[PDB]
Symmetry: C3
Subunit: 478 residues, 3 copies
């Protein structure tokens, strides 16, 4: 942050990713609310290289679209190079180069589409070191407890880099090496072209190994330079779903920490999932088993969770959102939502409103200070202020009617009222318990439909004789 | 996988397990859906020894039954040796031997009933090494950060094994040894009998230590061989509930990983509990706070969780099961269940069906494409296809009547309908909101019981004067 | 446990705690159900020093009250020293000394208000070592992977302590030191006064560093002694919310372990939060995603969770409390609560009672063997024994009426009954489904209000023509 020039970045993304066992292209799997690809491109764009090229393989029609979207989001131009068949990483670099002017003179940085955690600094350091050491190729390495599967970096006691050897081609002895190839490079474009031209597919994998390039350039008498990255997580890639979840977990730790340091109490970081676009205000407390997803925004002094999932929800200041499942909705200041509350898209709850337990709202607006405390569904309706919706009620329209039920302010509807849409209820109106409202109700009016209660006096003895409820017999002689 | 012959396995399980502080025999505590005992016997049977014997103690009537069950499940014969009083591990081995022909000539492998994670390879390697080194006794060891409580393996600089010393009998110096006895052995039966005969109870515990046997056989000039196990977890035992939860956690990690590698996305492995018999199809996504228990089976391309608990539930392909608690039930392809949904035993939901929020179903069948979206209980009933059960409804029978309410296809029942079982509703029937159905309803018919809505016009002012709902007064002059 | 005399303890708590980014004083943030301050004072009081003094800063009116409360709770006297401005830790010690008689002769122990995990032993060892070594000052140290931010303890090869150097004032070389100052001290009061008098504010922070005192006393030719604490967590302090959550997590591990060792099965310790005052009986099983808060007490042989949150709830023996959110309530032996159940303050559920799914109770008593199984709200009411409250019902009073609805024993109320408070229902009474009870109901009586079901026979064809529910047409010709 930022890059020099002219710098061109290739992002290899044309591998089959068979180890994911997925019918969804590897780079499109997500963590923290962005696909791996989106993560990679966001970091790269922040460095603003002259050219940004994504090498894609056979399923490129499924991916190029996303790339164009990111191009626009990122305010820049991102090109696509094709590689019909995965003949190797080296071959992929060729294809990606084919999208540069044959006379390109800038540095060529190579990275992968499956390293979500890679950051601006690590890249900027990479090129900087590459220029300082006047290297023909610079390669990022890191050390792993288990180096299995990755390229072993061969050094002489000199610490001089000799070559990179793949897991498949390595000897048992070489496999003990725990310093591995990160797969992030900086090249002198001419040396890169030269070296690539000479690759051979005589491998355990019979492919064209981009990694062979550090060996040919050693042998060319060129400057070959490795650069160790300590924070190995930054350089970690995703080849299967085990590694996906580990990177997800690790990214999540960093996002949660940042929030904690900015004044957010997270009781249980290991159990609080927060996407990268989420914002949270000061002195807010998040309880365990909570996930805040998409573009969710929480104000200050809120209490969220436990066991709460919010996608693209906006929460004002001083609100409580407990054991709630919700998406695309707004909760105003000092509102109380939960526990056991479901908000569907389109829900807007005003300041000091209350959505209680076993309440669901979809596409509804609920005015300041209004309470829907119990066992109620509110669909496609607008409610006013300081009203009180009785328990066990339902606002529903049997459709595709786009007419909305309307309820005024200071209303008090009775337990078990069914509102058949579309209907209009006036300010300070009441409804009787067990009322079916099919007709508008005037301000100050009382709507009712329930019949009068009648008592059948010795009914249990007569029509349920001998039962335990022959405890009426006990009660009588007492 | 598999074993040589003749090989006889003793499983010591006759200890009191006092450190569990439980009124339930240690080996019967569970993890990942099997008792420790069931885990142990499953691994052993896979190796198919000639003889399999379980030594049990005083509460053997509570355990022998389970053993016979496992015998049948495992397709083999498992014997029981008794040890009335826990006089020691050595003594337990005697008792277990008493169930072999006095002239038994095979190798005797000894293991414990409290090591759930022990695997086939570790055992097969054990006997193999025992035969190769022509050992009189071979003993599995491993190294622990905290070796507290376990037998210290004493070696000379030779790496030669000299003896095993128990925590209780060890010196402060010996206690620093971090290589410990795993309690898994292979014996030459004759040397074992010989050695056991000579044990003495002159201990800190005043018991007959099976471990003394490696010392007497050293002194006998017999071949004594230790075999180190690196993956210490495999050899970890459960003596208290701290260790139980650690092994549970570790087993769970391995089960989740396997699923991830086979193409299942688990967002949060630390918070996803999956029993050993559960199956999950490709590209399925499991969200945090989910447990899949018993013989639950999930198809492909499903979304399960967050906060979902399924025991013996079957889920087709492309289904969503979110914030659901359920057991012994089936959810067909493309069905949507949750959030906040409860399925009790006997529930069968057809393809493309929907069980919504704050819905409970027990012992009911629900046809293809049928929706029960809100606040409804469906008990002991059968519903047809493409129907729509209105919110806030109840299907209940006041019993022990085994007659089932029946609802046809393309039905649309109105909000707040109570169905008193047993009743039959015909295809394309409707019910009015707030209807109590006690009588059959013919196809194409409309059932209703609710009264007409009536409005009492200035009622709030008259019977609740001065209230905030004197906002009718405001409304009138506006 | 216990302390010698005369021993005086100063608790520094007058720092601004800016790194918390909180409008709530650092020492008042909580973990495991106690503020850091309450944790600190509880441990100190258990040692019973002659004098206990808390140094507070500008917001002391917000804290001194809590201190007085703890004074009473702890059965002792705790004084407050003021320090108007945070001029440094050394300066804070002065202020705290100002609350001792000018001729005080006892030892002075200094500790911080932000070290929740500090235990009795570590303190008792501190003074004991201080007296043994006849030290003028003894200082607790510990070793950290990341020593960032803490005072580096400078030793000569002698292991002799030379000085403590702060992060801000340390050299890059000194910063590599990973042995750090714990900020827990024991002093000879005279040497302490002497040394403090000579402090200088010529610092990177330009403050009066209590830490300089170990240097002046070295230079005084006094005895200076460091004491290493291995369990670094005991000596860990909270300066930001990252460290808060880590200590919370670590404390929680220790509390859960203790319970496990006393015979409580916790399936998932990392996901089970248990406050310090909670009690749990033998053979109880706690499932993942559970938090037991405040003074919650669980009997024996219970099943609690998953996804259960209890604050100050009392649970008898053999009860199941599953996916329940509850506070200030009681659940009797063998009761079944959940899943998806909400208990508000004042709820008392008798033995063998059942609160089912999507049920909420507030301030209500529910007799032995009574069942409220589905979709019901029970507010401010008293129910008798072996009754059965039908699904989809509501007990609610439209208020501030303190009269309580009353229901007798062996009652069976029908699905969709609304009870308008206050009302009285007699033993063995029944209610019809869809009944609005506004009037008392006599024993053995049947209350009803619902109208008779009527059928409109070809209604779908007539008033919804062409619809899919023209499957009545199909049904007719079949
Ligand atoms: C380059 C090589 O020989 N091996 C390196 C490669 O191993 P590894 O075998 O992991 O390389 P992959 O097969 O993951 O591919 C690396 C990147 O190149 C892409 N790709 C691969 C082949 C292809 O024909 N087209 C294509 O675009 C992949 O989509 C991926 O984005 O990366 C590791 C870091 O994670 C390094 O330690 C290895 O030394
Ligand atoms: C055998 C011995 O002296 N000590 C070993 C024993 O310690 P440890 O003291 O853990 O042995 P336990 O008391 O757990 O018993 C070991 C096994 O033998 C059974 N049992 C024990 C006593 C008895 O009289 N009857 C009986 O059947 C127990 O149920 C258990 O299945 O196992 C440890 C491994 O976990 C080893 O490191 C110790 O060196
Ligand atoms: C004392 C000092 O120079 N540095 C020590 C201080 O660092 P550190 O910089 O962490 O010290 P803090 O600023 O946290 O304050 C330490 C304690 O003293 C209190 N306080 C501080 C300043 C003040 O003017 N008034 C006041 O009461 C704080 O509220 C806190 O309770 O504690 C660390 C342990 O956590 C040690 O490793 C450092 O060597």
């Amino acid at each position: 942050m930022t890059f020099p020039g002219d710098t061109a970045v290739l992002v290899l993304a044309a591998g089959p990713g068979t180890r994911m066992r997925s019918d969804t292209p590897k780079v499109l799997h997500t963590l923290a609310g962005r696909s791996m690809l989106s993560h990679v491109l966001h970091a790269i764009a922040k460095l603003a290289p002259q050219r940004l090229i994504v090498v894609l393989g056979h399923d490129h029609q499924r991916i190029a679209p996303l790339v164009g979207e990111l191009a626009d989001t990122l305010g820049r131009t991102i090109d696509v190079a094709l590689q019909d068949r995965p003949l190797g990483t080296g071959h992929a670099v060729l294809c990606g180069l084919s999208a540069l002017p044959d006379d390109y003179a800038g540095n060529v940085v190579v990275t992968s589409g499956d390293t979500p955690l890679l950051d601006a600094d690590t890249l900027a350091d990479l090129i900087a070191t590459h220029r300082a050491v006047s290297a023909a190729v610079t390669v990022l390495t890191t050390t792993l407890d288990d180096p299995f599967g990755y390229g072993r970096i061969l050094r002489t006691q000199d610490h001089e880099v000799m070559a990179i050897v793949e897991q498949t081609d390595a000897t048992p002895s070489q496999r003990e090496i725990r310093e591995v190839n990160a797969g992030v490079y900086a090249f002198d474009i001419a040396a890169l072209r030269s070296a690539l031209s000479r690759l051979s597919s005589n491998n355990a994998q019979q492919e064209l190994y981009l990694t062979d390039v550090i060996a040919i350039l050693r042998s060319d008498g060129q400057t070959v330079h490795a650069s160790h990255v300590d924070d190995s997580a930054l350089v970690a890639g995703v080849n299967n779903r085990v590694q996906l979840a580990e990177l997800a977990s690790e990214l999540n730790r960093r996002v949660v920490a940042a929030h904690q340091l900015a004044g957010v109490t997270v009781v249980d970081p290991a159990t609080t999932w927060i996407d990268v676009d989420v914002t949270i205000g000061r002195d807010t407390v998040i309880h365990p088993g909570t996930q805040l997803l998409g573009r969710t925004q929480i104000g200050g002094r809120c209490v969220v969770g436990p066991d709460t999932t919010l996608t693209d929800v906006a929460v004002g200041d001083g609100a409580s959102v407990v054991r709630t499942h919700g998406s695309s909705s707004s909760i105003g200041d000092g509102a109380a939502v939960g526990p056991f509350t479901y908000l569907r898209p389109g829900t807007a709850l005003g300041a000091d409103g209350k959505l209680g337990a076993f309440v669901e709202v979809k596409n509804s607006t609920i005015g300041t200070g209004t309470k829907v405390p119990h066992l109620t569904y509110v669909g496609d309706a607008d409610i006013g202020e300081y009203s009180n919706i009785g328990a066990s009620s339902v606002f529903v329209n049997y459709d595709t009617s786009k007419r909305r039920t309307t309820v005024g302010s200071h209303v008090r509807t009775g337990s078990d009222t069914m509102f058949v849409a579309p209907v209009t209820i006036g300010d300070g109106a009441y409804t009787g318990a067990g009322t079916v409202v099919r007709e508008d109700v005037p301000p100050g009016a009382l709507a009712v439909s329930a019949g009068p209660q009648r008592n059948i006096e010795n009914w249990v003895q007569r029509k349920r004789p001998g039962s335990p409820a022959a405890q009426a017999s006990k009660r009588a002689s007492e």
